[PDB]
Every structure is written in structure tokens, then in C-alpha cells.
Design an enzyme around this catalytic site. Structure first.
Site, mmCIF file in Angstrom:
data_model
loop_
_atom_site.group_PDB
_atom_site.id
_atom_site.type_symbol
_atom_site.label_atom_id
_atom_site.label_comp_id
_atom_site.label_asym_id
_atom_site.label_seq_id
_atom_site.Cartn_x
_atom_site.Cartn_y
_atom_site.Cartn_z
ATOM 1 N N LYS C 293 -77.247 19.007 23.279
ATOM 2 C CA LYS C 293 -77.258 18.953 24.740
ATOM 3 C C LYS C 293 -77.099 17.496 25.166
ATOM 4 C CE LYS C 293 -79.997 23.113 25.560
ATOM 5 N NZ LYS C 293 -78.966 23.837 26.355
ATOM 6 N N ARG C 370 -79.738 34.039 21.538
ATOM 7 C CA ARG C 370 -79.290 35.381 21.185
ATOM 8 C C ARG C 370 -79.407 35.655 19.692
ATOM 9 N NH1 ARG C 370 -73.672 34.370 23.610
ATOM 10 N NH2 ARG C 370 -75.218 33.154 24.781
#
Ligand SMILES: [Zn+2]
Ligand SMILES: [Zn+2]
Ligand SMILES: [Zn+2]
Ligand SMILES: [Zn+2]
Ligand SMILES: [Zn+2]
Ligand SMILES: [Zn+2]
Lengths: 517, 511, 509
Positions: C293, C370
Site C-alpha cells: 500500500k 478474500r
């Protein structure tokens, strides 16, 4: 000549061009080495090398016609100096007539056979000794072995770097230029037919550099075409400047769309040199002439776009005009040369052409614009259709087309594309004799399918291939159907970033190509 | 009315094809209980196998040809599977000893074909038509379709078959046979599908038309021609009349353009008594450069911004269908504030304060949010008409690509009954639409320190909802809905528009 | 169980205060009929004016002559009812005792939304934070149903409480005046239980990643189950390797903290008629992996809250464990790990195998939520439950779809989706239903693995991620709440505790 439009009365209405440079006042005299050197007034410089020995000792091998200077230049005194490429030293002594003289040398390394880049490094050191000194004569002694082309290249480069452009200085200035240049070289009678050829090739490069370095408020489509008329008038060349009304009748929709957003009307330059004896060779030279490339609505806003340099987007046009001077002066025969350039300005305006607009070229092909900053191939497309209609044998275009050249060949070598053996090979051969390096690059036909437009006949840019220089050649190839055609991308080599000046690249390359057919 | 030009080569009208090759196809429906006749180019069976994964395709219709019946025997066809989209071609001689060609399309194993799956079946069918020079095509529906899905099959068949060549410079089948059970109940869907097809294709023609062809003047010129070719009342409002209506927000967007603003107002009225007044508004930005907030970002998609008038095309495409089918007890107003968002010395600036026709002052925070400025003045104009429903459709916010994506449009509104009128129309028109909320908490972020309201928010990054909050301030009392089609308007894979919204609005008017 | 350290000064447990000052507040609810008593403390009237920015009007009988003169219509007209506006004055009552009287404007709308209620509380809490009162009295001159009345109490308690666990005068009584007081009385102690469940989850989220790691978070989960008497079992790396949880174990490969799978269970005293599994994404810190990030807007400094779903699930375990619902079995699950960059981390392009045998092509290491949920969903399905509800800070695209106010819900069964929406209405934690568009499913087809982890064409990440999790629920009604945009309150620089009260209302009804 047209009237240059202005926003305010302080806007310039013409490009200043220097025709009579101090280089033209230098009396050049060449002597044969097998007769001795006479150390005279000013500065005398020896070009010395040492093959095999890296940074070997300096050794003067030429007879000096002065007992005192010969004692100074003996082997037991050169010793403490070496021949590293680019090194220079100054000597002060008194000659046999009790007069003070200045002598020195510039190291030419080992290698024995010096490249164009290496010779420039030697010349730059030579110019440093010419700078900040008030000499009236410089003498150069060639103790390094050079052929005729490299000797001419030495004079051209020396003249070009010695010359200083002060056209746009006002409060700024400084000091003078030498009046005489002496050259000592073995077999001197063979080398000196190149002297006046070097003086002609110099101004063509400097004239192109003058036009490129001229900013876009000075150098715009109106003032640039006026200078070509002025140049053609001094050289007695046939000329025709096409205005919008004539370009509308020729249906140059691709060229006209680029200049819609400019306050300067489009001007198509068409110069012609014709030979007296019957013409056995017809050549058309096309140069990209975008006096300023803002990029259009695809504005150059990314950090690397270098928009403050985009006055150089007419470097192709300047190279053709520089060739027009050199060819117009030396006057080769049995050739017709057409000097063409579709000149305009790519601006942002309510009248500008849009990304996605579909335009029609003069040959009937419809083009979907995918990026307004790809305006070069649009102006070149209409110029190539115009060029082929002239019925020429070779079409050679030169353009600052794609910034991708900085990532392929860099700042030293230009790229050449084409559809024919020998036009590429003749161009590559001309690169050898002109000493302006060019590399042959491929037109990969596999990428042609990525230019398939869903609505127009062809896309202006590809949607997948990031090799912009190759795609642009594929696009330009679509507008030359039957004539032998070559394309020179000089976008990476035109500007000298370190020296913050143009190179005038293309003038000597294009002229040598015309002179060797 | 006159299109301005910079050079004499600038176009002055949008090329429009009104009689497409699809209109030359005689479409003819027969009942499947009676046999199929074989004797021409291509005959296609639509086959499925409910249950078997990729099981065998089974021919169930009686074929009135002995030799073609033997070819289609169960011991013969067995090999081929029913996988959705698969296709195979056959060659054989019929009972008259003539050479014929037959084939099939696999329809999967789901007894009810999805409204996206039928598209895949149609696209497989179109592939057989493209590289072929056939004179007639016959389709045998050996699968279940209802009346709405059958119309969708023809519409998608018509639209995908058609090829847009208006900007090219340097054959189609002539008969379509359909063998389907209870053909008498499906027959009425034939000419309704062809009308829906051209409305969508007419919208696609306006969208695909580039911005040098499609400009505020040339687009309104196409609207009066369409209104004249149909029979709608029409009036095009020039800058002079928009100034008297004090529509300053709309006029400020087009200030930097070389084309004057043109407000489209078409009207269809029913012959009988009117029980419903409807205003359909479409965002009509012929080209969106972004203004001084220039679209220079990597994902800005500046080369496709000719599509920022898709909402206007959707309204005009629906106007063709309404003007043709002539529904009753209805009055429809087709509105669009058409202009161009350019960069110029005359453009409006970030930070400018402008006044809409309803008196509200707006502080411009971003010139690329120009659609809501034109829509705001168009919504005040729409509400002044005294209508029952106002529906606007717009390629408003690129955030739709990250919310619902490229398949589903978003609908907002201040009246839930109208949303279900749109959601019901989305179901029967087969143009998918999802309901998204107008979150009132974000409204405070539009509070301007100096003007009445901010054009955009600074804190909330949910631009699709914030933009709807902005438009909601310009509908005072009327039920209003908003369809954001910025993500679904362009088919990126097919490199062509979808004509999205034409059938959704027509089904909304017709029900 | 033992938290590893790099240096001896690294923390080895998350601090939690279970006994907050809110739990010492005695709450009394009176009916407005019969007059209000203004004796001690601060008394605030909740007033609206159905107009826009209209005057303030007090319509309740005050049993004090001195305070009644202050609240005369002529004296109160100089103040307006703009939503959030507040004024409070200090004065003498009939007994010459110092009292404070004021109001909080509730706008010109009769029915307040949950966000409007939040704004009203913030003005009240700001007045409590700047005053040294012993008792707060609130007079309800507005209409609120029993759910909004309880929501008022939960939000008041939560915003009033101040977390000082990492730093180096609360009221003792709360009076509420409202017409029809007897029906609202039952909501008081439910709000206190609802409050701490929200505040407990906030403590876990606000705890930084050096404090809250997979070991210390699972250790705190065990402690909570022991305080409530719930079943607990924590799966270690050796057990997760036996269950072949390759996707979950690959995400935590590069972390210094071992993977810990939380499995809590509540079960009723009667017979069980409904079994529910609640799954929460528990990434204690999300560096993004090798897909770091680092781009502008990624907010790497706030990524301690990527375990907000787990905190919401554990906060639900407190609420359920305290109120003790009947005839129901609830399983609280969380696959807790940490996504870091290291020589041992998993790489972009790696092909991993989930616990159901499916091979997954990793296209982005920052889409790790996920991956852990996929193995957690397979684990939940083997439990034999009726509903599987997962809650996760999954996709940053939610900030561009629904924003910071509404969470998105997905699912494979629109009967279960209806149940979660209904709890959103009663819990007043707003949630909106978003579609699982099957047309995008083809873009998850991998050339080499069974399925792609991410798409390369569809930029609707919230829908694409829901399609991925959908492949790991074969049998059960399953729903998915994405709280990536609503979990952290950026204006207040603190968590919201989103999902705790929503999930609890789902379990109780
Ligand atoms: Zn360019
Ligand atoms: Zn250029
Ligand atoms: Zn815009
Ligand atoms: Zn727009
Ligand atoms: Zn992540
Ligand atoms: Zn994460």
C-alpha cells in the site's frame, strides 16, 4: 510573405537569422606537414595520440622550423604530459626571433581510429582553449591519422561549437573570434577541397540550429515560412507557400485539423532546386514542422513530457531547410530536390481538434484521432501524399516524432525506417560519410492490425503496442503506396540536453544523401 | 441551425442511416407444430439439455425433409454438446436433391436462459452470418422464451448483425424465418423488436459519431429532422432564449465552446385524453474535455468522451420508439441541454459562482462535473412543465465503474414508486438497472460558504450519490428519478456503444 | 498462546477495560406527563420545528418557576432548531441551586434518521465533555420509536466514553423524560449491553498492530469466551495444515506471528432450531504484501482496522453471550493472520490451494481478505449451519460506491439478504443491498489455476470479490457485508464499531 498575427504590439513579427557569422570571416590556410611547421602569432595546437599505450607519453613527431621551439617540444620535455582523450596543456616560450609564442596540444587517446563522438570530445577541448583567450589565429597540427570525411567533420564541428548564438541576448554579452586558421596535415593537397565544403555544411547546421532554438513566439508557422521564402530568395530557389485556401482545395484534412486551434494559419513550405543538365534523379525531402507542440487536449502534463522544450518539434523542418542551403550553394547536378514541410502549431483552444475526432486525409483515408499529441504523423501523412504526387524517385522524411526514441536508441543515434533496401542503405551509407549516426529500425507488420479502427479506415495510434516509433512508421507507410520511402526519427538526437542547445541534426546527413546519387 | 466551421473541411451534419439492411429483411414466424422446411442457405436449431452438464443436444422438432431428418437422428447428433455458445455447421442434400446447410447453437443446461446468456447465443449466431454470404436464415426455437425474451432475441440479433460504416471510405440476409411454438402469440413481437432495434441503433449512431461531426448544433439539427420525420412538436432553444430564462448554470458550461448552446424540446401528445405527463431528460455534453479541470489523469479516457451525450441519445432513441408506436393517454417531453465543455479564454473557471434558473447560486469546484450543471437547469425546465414524472439519464460519474461496473446501471430518485416503474421497465426491457440510495448525510458536504450550494463535495468520495444529492435540490415537488449510465453506456470489449436506455425508457412510457 | 517479541519492550497483550464509567450511570426514565423536575445537573430539551431553521419552543411543563421563566417562548425564540445547534445556560432554580438548562436542535423533520440522531448526540456529548455535571437529564420533545430510543442511548454511551488505554469526571445519573415512558423502559439495559459490544470491538480495532497481532487477538478472544462461558478452540498452524487451509496459511507466511483461527460457539439451553455461523476478516495489519500500500490514497497508516470484521464478530459474541438468546446455536469464526513483506511472504502469481481443493492464482497480495475468508467459509460450511454471514473490510472501492455511511451486503440467497436488511432497520446501522453480477464471473477464469483471485478487466472490485467468495459456498445460505468504507470514522479519527449491533439484532430475531 504573409503578415505575422500578433496579440500585443510587442509580439515579434520575424525570426532573426544571422547569415554572416564570424566563422565566415576566418581565413583558412592549410599546409603540408612534410615542410615543417612555423610557430606564429596566436595559439598553435598539436593533435597527438599514442596507439596501444593507454594514457601514453606525448611525442611531437613534426619538424618545427624553430630551433627554440623544437628544443621546447623535444621528447625529454613532452614526457610529463599524456595523451588521454580530451586532455590539453598550454605552453609559453620565445622563438628564434625573440618573440613570445603560445603552443599546446590536445590528447587524442590511443585507438588510432577516432569515432565521431571521440572527435567531438577533442574539438570541445580545442574550443575551451579558444574561449576566454583573445587570439587572432589558431593553428592545428594533425599528428593523428584522419580521412577526408573525418577531417571535414573536424572543421564543421569546430566551427559549430566555436560559434555562439547571442540573437536573444540584450543586457548580456562579453568578449572575439580568431581571424585565421592554419592546418598542418600529411598529403594536405587532398584534404583541402573539404575546407569550403565544411564551411557550407557548418552554416546549414547553424541555420537549422538558429531556427530550432528560436522560440515559438518568434518561430511560428507564419514567420517560419517567411524565413524559408527569404532563404529561397537568396539561393534563387523556386518556392511556393500553400495557404489554408489551397490546402482546403487539396483536402488536407489531417494537416488542417492539427492547426485549427492555433492563431497562426497553416503554411505548407515547398522549395525546389532544379539542375541544368537533364534530371536523372528526383528526390522529395519532408520535414515535420510543428513550431510548438502543446500536445493539444492530450496536454503535455506528465512530468517527463518536457513541454518547455517543444519549440524543437520543428527540428525536422529545420533539417530540410538546412539541406536546402547546402544543396543550393554547392549546386549538384542531374537532381531535382523538393524541400517540403507541413508547418502548423498544436494548441489548446475552443477551435482545437478533439481526441476521438475522425478526419479525412488528402488520399481519401479516414483517421480516428486517439491522441492529439500524435499530431506529427497526421501532418506528415498529408505531406507524403503531396510528396508522392510530385513524381519523385525517393521520399525521405525527418521528424521529431516519438519520445520513445529516448528509450530505444537514446540521444546519440537516430532511427531510420523504410520500405526499400537501398533507400535505407543509401541513407545508412550517407550516415557514414556525414558522420551523423543513424540506425536502421524495423517496420513490424504484425502491429498493423492494432491500427484497425472500428469506424474509420485506420487508427492514428495503437491500443496495445507500446512501441510508438514502430507504429508511427506503420501509419506513415499507409500513405506512400508506390514510391520508395524512408523515415528518420530524430526525436531523441535533435536537442543537446547537456549543452542546452540544438544540434542541427539531419542537415549533413540529408545533404550527403543528395550529393551521392 | 447553421453549424460553424473552423476550416471548410469541418463537417456540418451527422451522417445518419435511416434504412438499415435489417429493415430489408422480411421476418416471418411459423408454428413449430407443423414441421420445418429445408431448402436454403442456413438453418439453425437452438438446443439445450436441462440437467446434463454439457450433455447432448436433442432435435425435437419434426423436420419435413426425409434426408435432413435422417441427418438429425439421435444416433447422429449425439456427439455435439449443448455448451452455451457452441456452434457447428452441416452440409447435406434435401428431398429435392438440393444442397442445403443446417447447424445448431448450444443453449446450455438452464431451462430459463439468462438475459446475458441470450446475448452469447445471439453472438454465436452472428458469427455464422458474418463470414457467410447467405440469402435467408431460419431459426427454430427448441428452447423456452417468453414474449419479452423473444423480442430481446430479435433486438440483439438486429443490433449485433448491423454494421456501422458511416465513417469508412478507403452481404446481408434478405429473409428471416422463425419456427416457434404458439407462433400466433409471439407474432406481434416482430415489428416491436425492429422498432426497438433502430431506436437503439439511432442512439448508437449519435454516440459513435465523433465530436467534430456531433456538435451542439448538428445534434439538435438531427433532433428536428427526427421530430419532423416522426410527428412530435419541436422547439430548439438558442442562447438568446436561454438567457431570458436565466439558465446560467447550463450557459456557463458551454461558455468555452465554439458552438452555441442548444436546448432540445420534443413533445409527443396522445390523441385521446392524457392521464400521465412525463419528462425525459438526457445529459447532452457532445464532448467533455473536463474544462480547466482537464482530463489528464491516466484513467480519464479522454478519447472516448464523445459519449458524454449518451443520455441525450437515449432520450432521442426513445423518442423514435414512442413516436412510432404512439401509446395513448400519455404526454412525453424529450429534453436535453446540449453543449460542449471546452478549454478556452471564454471557459468558466474552477471557483466560479453561477446562478441557475431557479435562483440557486452554485460554486463550481470542478469543471469536469459539468453534467449536473446542465441537468440542474434542465430539471428546473422539466418541472416548470407541470409533469407527473421526471426521469433523467446521464453519463454522470465515472465512479459507476467501481460501484456497479459495466453491466448494471444505477438508478436514484426521490420517489420509490417511480423507481419500481423504472425497475419494472428494466426487467421487461432487459436493460439491467440496480437501485442505489440517496444518502442524505452527505448533503452537508455541499454546503457552500459563499454560494447557496457547492457543485461537488470535498469529503465524500461517493460521487454517484453526491451528484444525485445535487440534482435532488432542483426538483422541488415532482417525483424524479436519475439513471447513471456512465459505466454501461460504452461497450469497451466490442469497441462500440450499446445504445443503453432506449428500451428501458420506452418500456417505462408504454406501461 | 505466548506472544513472540522482537525486543523485550514489545507488548504481549491487548489492554481492555471491561468496567467502563458508563456502567456506573444510574438511568431513570420518566413520563413527560406530570411535569419535569429541574433540581440538579444539566437538563437538555430535544426540540424541532416542523420551519427550516425555525425558532425553539419548549412545550413541557417544568416544575420550577425560575427555570420556567427561562423557557418562556419569548426567551427561547432567540435560538433556532438547526440540526446540531445547541445552547446551555447556568441559572438558579427555586431553591437557589445552580442548574444548567439547554437544548439541541433536531431540525424541521419529524422522523429522524440514524445519521441525524448521531449529530444530535455529538452536540450532547460535547456539552458533557466541557461541563462537570453529576446528572444529565434529557427531555424528549420529538418522536422516536423504541429502536431509535435505544439507538440514542447506545450512541450517547459510546461517544461519551473515551479510550485512554494508550495515554500516559463522568456523570453518575441519567434522567430521560419522554411521553409514553413505560414502553421505552425495557430498552435501557439492552442499550448498555449493545454499547459495550460496540465499545469492545472499538477497543480491538483502535488497538495498534504491535499490540493487536494474531496471537494477542486470539488470546483476547479466549479470555472473552471464559468470561461469558462460551465454547472456544483456537486452531494452530499444525491443525490448519491438517485442514489444508493453503489460502489462509499463504497470507500469513511472511508474518512473524503464527496463524490463529478463532472458533467460538454459543449454544442455547433449550433445543436448537437455528444454527448460524458468523465469519469476520481478521487481518491484524495489512501492509498489502508485496503489492504494498504505497500509492497515494492507500492509507497504510490506518491499516490496523483490517480486522474490523473480526472485532464486529467478537463484539457480537459478547452481546449474544450476555443477553442469552434461546433455541439457537451461533458460531463466531475468524481466520486471523498478518499480511507483511518478508523473504517468507507469498508472491504475486503464486498458485495456492484452498481447503476444498480449488487452486487459486494470486494476482494481488493486497487482496488477501478474500483468501482468508475462502478457507474460513469452507470451515463454516462443514459445521452444518443454516446461514453463513461474513463481515469484512474487503475492498476500498466501497468508498466510491456507497461511501462512509452505508455498508454493502451481498449474498446467494435473497431471503437471508432480507433478514440482514431488517436488522439494519432495527439496529440503525445502515446497510444497502448490492448485486452479485454473474456476467463478471468469466473474468475470474484463470489460464492455469482453477480460478483467479482478482479480475483484470472489471473495475467493480466489491462485486468481483463477492463472486470469488461465492465459489466457496456450495450448500448454505450465505451473505457478505463489506464494511471497508464505514468501519473507521475519519472525522472522529476513531472506529465506529460497525456490525456489532447489526449482527446481534440478526441473531435475536
Ligand atoms: Zn506531439
Ligand atoms: Zn510532435
Ligand atoms: Zn465532465
Ligand atoms: Zn460529463
Ligand atoms: Zn489487503
Ligand atoms: Zn485487507
Amino acid at each position: 510573405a504573409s503578415e505575422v498575427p500578433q496579440v500585443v504590439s510587442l509580439d515579434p513579427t520575424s525570426i532573426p537569422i544571422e547569415y554572416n557569422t564570424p566563422i565566415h570571416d576566418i581565413k583558412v590556410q592549410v599546409y603540408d606537414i612534410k615542410g615543417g611547421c612555423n610557430v606564429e602569432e596566436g595559439l598553435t595546437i598539436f593533435l597527438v595520440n599514442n596507439p596501444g599505450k593507454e594514457n601514453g607519453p606525448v611525442k611531437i613527431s613534426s619538424k618545427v622550423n624553430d630551433k627554440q621551439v623544437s628544443e621546447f617540444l623535444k621528447d625529454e620535455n613532452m614526457e610529463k604530459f599524456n595523451v588521454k582523450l580530451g586532455t590539453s596543456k598550454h605552453f609559453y616560450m620565445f622563438n628564434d626571433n625573440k618573440n613570445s609564442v603560445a603552443v599546446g596540444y590536445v590528447g587524442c587517446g590511443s585507438v588510432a581510429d577516432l569515432s565521431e563522438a571521440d572527435m567531438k570530445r577533442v574539438v570541445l577541448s580545442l574550443v575551451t582553449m579558444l574561449h576566454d583567450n583573445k587570439l587572432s589565429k589558431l593553428t592545428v597540427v594533425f599528428e593523428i591519422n584522419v580521412d577526408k570525411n573525418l577531417f571535414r567533420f573536424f572543421l564543421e564541428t569546430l566551427f559549430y561549437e566555436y560559434m555562439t548564438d547571442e540573437r536573444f541576448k540584450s543586457t548580456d554579452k562579453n568578449v572575439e573570434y580568431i581571424k585565421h586558421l592554419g592546418v598542418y596535415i600529411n598529403n594536405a593537397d587532398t584534404y583541402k577541397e573539404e575546407v569550403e565544403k565544411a564551411r557550407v555544411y557548418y552554416f546549414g547546421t547553424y541555420y537549422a540550429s538558429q531556427l530550432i532554438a528560436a522560440p515559438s513566439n518568434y518561430c511560428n508557422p507564419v514567420s517560419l515560412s517567411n524565413a524559408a521564402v527569404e532563404l529561397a530568395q537568396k539561393l534563387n530557389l523556386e518556392y511556393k507557400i500553400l495557404g489554408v485556401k489551397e490546402l482546403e482545395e487539396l483536402k488536407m484534412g489531417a494537416y488542417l485539423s492539427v492547426g485549427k486551434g492555433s492563431m497562426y494559419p497553416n503554411k505548407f513550405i515547398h522549395l525546389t532546386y532544379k539542375s541544368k543538365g537533364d534530371v536523372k534523379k528526383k528526390i522529395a525531402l519532408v520535414g515535420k514542422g510543428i513550431t510548438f507542440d502543446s500536445g493539444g487536449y492530450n496536454l503535455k502534463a506528465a512530468p517527463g513530457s518536457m513541454i518547455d522544450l517543444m519549440k524543437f518539434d520543428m527540428s525536422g523542418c529545420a533539417a530540410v531547410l538546412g539541406c536546402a542551403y547546402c544543396v543550393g550553394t554547392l549546386k549538384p547536378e542531374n537532381v531535382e530536390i523538393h524541400f517540403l514541410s507541413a508547418v502548423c502549431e498544436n494548441m489548446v483552444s475552443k477551435n482545437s481538434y478533439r481526441p476521438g475526432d475522425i478526419i479525412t486525409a488528402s488520399n481519401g483515408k479516414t483517421i480516428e484521432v486517439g491522441n492529439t499529441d500524435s499530431e506529427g504523423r497526421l501532418t506528415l501523412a498529408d505531406a507524403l501524399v503531396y510528396a508522392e504526387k510530385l513524381g519523385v524517385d525517393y521520399i525521405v522524411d525527418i521528424a521529431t516524432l516519438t519520445g520513445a526514441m529516448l528509450y530505444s536508441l537514446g540521444t546519440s543515434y537516430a532511427g531510420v525506417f523504410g520500405n526499400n533496401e537501398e533507400l535505407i542503405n543509401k541513407i545508412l551509407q550517407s550516415s557514414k560519410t556525414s558522420n551523423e549516426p543513424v540506425w536502421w529500425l524495423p517496420i513490424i507488420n504484425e502491429y498493423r492490425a492494432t491500427l484497425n479502427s472500428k469506424y474509420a479506415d485506420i487508427n492514428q495510434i495503437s491500443s496495445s503496442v507500446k512501441a510508438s516509433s514502430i507504429v508511427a512508421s506503420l501509419f506513415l507507410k499507409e500513405f506512400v503506396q508506390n514510391t520508395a520511402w524512408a523515415h528518420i526519427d530524430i526525436a531523441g538526437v535533435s536537442w543537446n540536453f547537456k549543452a542546452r542547445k540544438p544540434k542541427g541534426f539531419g542537415v549533413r546527413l540529408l545533404t550527403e544523401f543528395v550529393l551521392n546519387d
